[PDB]
């Protein structure tokens, strides 16, 4: 290369730029803006130069996603193919309706009345706007679609209204092939809400040892205990994992961006919780006071607002264990794996094979203890010392077998088993109660009792 | 409870780089290497008869920082060719800047104050040159973390 | 760290000996490169720049799933 | 990172000659030889309460040098005689110059200041005659290499 | 009753703002920035033949303000300027305004009434500039909660 | 606001020339060359008798001048001898001009006033000779950007 300058300076406005370890989302939309199943992203800039259109599904939960205290540098996409896509106008609006739509760039202008005559008067300037895009009215909503391979894209925007695509790939068949792709992710959301989709990814999501997290819209999250009509309570039955939480704008803000940016960068070995955590763009939760100890039962968190903040109460997933106890076993189990992997290969590699003898075994102490279990304690996750009550200590042990007691048919397969080790959780705090008291004029004089207090009544016999 | 270690690298004095001018000192004695100190308190407290207590803040960062070096560096003849030239022309001013290893930091703007006495015995001796620094502010740069914000209750 | 290799008597070829001439020592070195040019990126705040992240744990350098 | 030696010839006290009108002095005591101090500060700092500092440079480089001598030297009567002889005629001053081994050296005109105690004991005792020079700036002619120039970003 | 914190902030003596003509003055030196003082007594008490007690209110307001200053501040040079041009032409009266912090402040015309001794010595020396002041009544201004307090007052 | 280094290059004692007729002056001594100092105040205030303040320039500007010198120098021996000419013949005023360093400075007319008191001691002494000045008014002079400065303060 030739350098004119032997020093040269960059000069930018607004803002110096902001690199560490995370875990990566993924959000299964539906789009066709890519032959590819899955594709990362750093910015929503690159979402739109990659034909997105602003407020589209995609773009609104990557949007939220980096907006989190703890919002990871890097969210991924999948991808469903679109059959069609909807505008839905059930609702009153008073308002110009600035609908952003793309073609492999315009913003349609829409003035307000009642939906049936603002979803006609969408569906005019659609046409004769462009020829290679469908677009009709039906009641009240208009249905988009497009005519040819060309990539169509619509947005949001100044209006009350939401977008509903649709695909026919079900979401059951679909995660098979992503994962195939790429295998670098941790968060599962998925766009398409409906109560199978949702439960067949969930099922994925367990045996892939994946967290699967979705809002929802749906009244009956706080509907009385009996009525079991909920997506909410279908999952309670089943023993599932999942994080859900009940939201109003679920369905237009794809607010599971907001959950997932205060947890990409929260590691879990601190052991800390979902507890009073803010999220920024989701509303707090209205619904009375009962409603709100109805969705409790239901495993139905909820964003509350509290002395003029938001904060997020409770991340108890629908089996009823809270999420951090959940994040931590899924740590344990990485960090582990990794740990004594990676020792094998720093061995196998130098010639020198670790070998199945009482002379190499116990080594394994050593690498356990230093990579997961020394963390834990530094940061706290990982409870150490002594027992009063119990008389028991929580110091963390690790027992290894001896040569003479593997069974012969072990040792012709070449495999180890029956390593067992113990670790005690250290709980965070989230609930107090006090007992004040107030004292008018004068309280009366009080014991004058000079004697240790005896801890024991003499009869007891 | 278990005893933890503080920091994952250990303290390497010769990581400890002292810039004076621009160029790296080298010849240090002994015993200590740098020491910092201020001038007078940071905050000084109004005590009252009856309990009312009021405080002020001051506005005098001046310190003076102390080189130990050996009787048989260049720098000791760099330091008083110097001197002589600050007192002949009149310019006195020369930048500062100590780069910490695993603590605090420092740069300012520093000047010659003191000579240091010189002995010559049986063994090789030390010399002290004084210099003083327009504010003694410890800055830590290095360490990463930002919980100023999350302290206080004030 | 240089380093010097030298050989061993028994390990002279017969004929070397005879013409008294000694072969095979050799040295490494590394050489220190000067620097010749440098980049700078400056940046230039307008006003009021948004509150920073409050996350105060210590940065995790890889992410636990690699498998 | 290697140790690396400062000055390739070893510090030979014998080499300290010290020069005291011309004649070479003989009789040095133990541990200490020759001690150099000067009066007062070089640069004084006028602190402000807003923050502005202002310096002022000395004038006056008085200095005491202060020599170590055995009893049974005879420098020591020279010492006395000398000061009795500046006492009745009046004339005080003499040259003094000081040559370092591998450090800094010294050349001015100096007097005799102040005359020592005489302990007499058991073993053989030890007397610091205290001498004045009229300037007490060390000089590094000895040392090779001008980086004063090179050095300083002021 | 137990100890208690007079204020929430600390005073800060670089928060204290002198303007003289309209521009803030830099220089400063030692321990005493600014020194507000009065010239007479607001009230004079006569006594009298039978034990009455005469008070006359004083209607004079006239105060004088010692600035101290480095002799390296431009400063010195700005007022002895101002000071040759007020001989040549007659202006002399320019205003003065000194904000405080978490005390009293001023607000008023002042004038340059001595000129200070020059000191050439070993260290760097100090000049105390004289300016009188035509009111020298001190403002709560800042101080919040002082209205209230006024009226709260008796006496008859 | 942080701190702030006031110049560039530090006050230098030396740096500071004195000259009385024509010659510069060597021998001072302790720890305070020269005191430049004025006789009266530049304005004299009166009060009224309905809060009025009237306000009268000064027109006399003689001042004073320490020299401080050791009992060891020849320009004591110079200025005896100019006394005693001066007193026999009756020319007694002669130029006087101080060049400051980073401060103020002084050039006018001036002449002398009183002799110092000799004092033989143990130690070496020290006299001070007063030096009368026609005019006391500091020049800024060297002092750099004190034109703009004055015509930018504001006064009615």
Known sequence: ???????????????????????????????????????????????????????????????????????????????????????????????????????????????????????????????????????????????????????????????????????????????????????????????????????????????????????????????????????????????????????????????????????????????????????????????????????????????RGLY??????????????????????????FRMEESVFAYMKRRSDMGLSMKMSDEDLPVLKSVLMNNPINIGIRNGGILTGYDTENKVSYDPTIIIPKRANIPTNDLAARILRDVKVELVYNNSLHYVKIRASVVLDRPAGQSTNAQTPMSSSAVGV | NQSKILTLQAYDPAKVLVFIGGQRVSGFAADTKIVITRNNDNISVHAGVDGEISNALSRDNTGVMTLSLQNTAKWNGYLAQWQRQANVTGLIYLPVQVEGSQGLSLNTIGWIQKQPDLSYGTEVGQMDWEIGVLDAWLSPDQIQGIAAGITGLL
């Open chain 1, 1 to 303: 290369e030739y350098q004119d300058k032997v020093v040269d300076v960059e000069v930018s406005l607004g803002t110096q730029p902001i690199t560490v370890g995370f875990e990566t989302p993924m959000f299964l939309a539906m789009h066709g803006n890519f032959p590819e199943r899955i594709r990362f992203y750093v910015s929503t800039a690159g979402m739109v130069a990659d034909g997105f259109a602003v407020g589209s599904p995609a773009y609104q939960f990557a949007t939220n996603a980096f907006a989190g205290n703890f919002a990871p540098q890097r969210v991924a996409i999948g991808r469903m193919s679109i059959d069609s896509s909807k505008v839905d106008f059930t609702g009153t609006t008073n308002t110009e309706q600035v609908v952003v739509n793309i073609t492999l760039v315009k913003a349609v202008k829409i003035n307000v009345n009642t939906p049936a005559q603002i979803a006609t008067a969408l569906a005019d300037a659609v046409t004769a706007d462009t020829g290679k895009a469908t677009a009709v009215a039906t009641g009240t909503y208009v249905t988009v679609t497009a005519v040819s391979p060309n990539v169509v894209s619509v947005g949001k925007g100044a209006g009350v209204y939401k977008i509903v695509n649709e695909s026919s790939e079900t979401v059951a068949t679909v995660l098979p092939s992503v994962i195939a792709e790429n295998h670098n992710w941790y968060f599962l959301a998925t766009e398409a809400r409906s109560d199978a989709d949702i439960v067949a990814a969930a099922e994925f999501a367990k045996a892939n040892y994946k967290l699967h997290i979705y809002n929802s819209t749906d009244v009956d999250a706080y509907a009385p205990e009996n009525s079991a009509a909920s997506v909410f309570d279908t999952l309670k039955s089943l023993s599932y994992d999942s994080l859900g939480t009940s939201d109003a704008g679920a369905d237009v803000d794809f607010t599971e961006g907001s959950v997932i940016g205060a947890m990409a960068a929260n590691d879990p070995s601190y052991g800390d919780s979902l507890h009073l955590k803010t999220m920024p763009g989701m509303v707090p939760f209205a619904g009375s006071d009962t409603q709100r100890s109805n969705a409790w039962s239901r495993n139905a968190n909820i964003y």
């Open chain 1, 308 to 333: 003029g903040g938001g904060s997020y109460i409770e991340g108890k997933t629908s089996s009823g264990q809270y999420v951090d106890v959940i994040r931590f076993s899924h740590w344990v189990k």
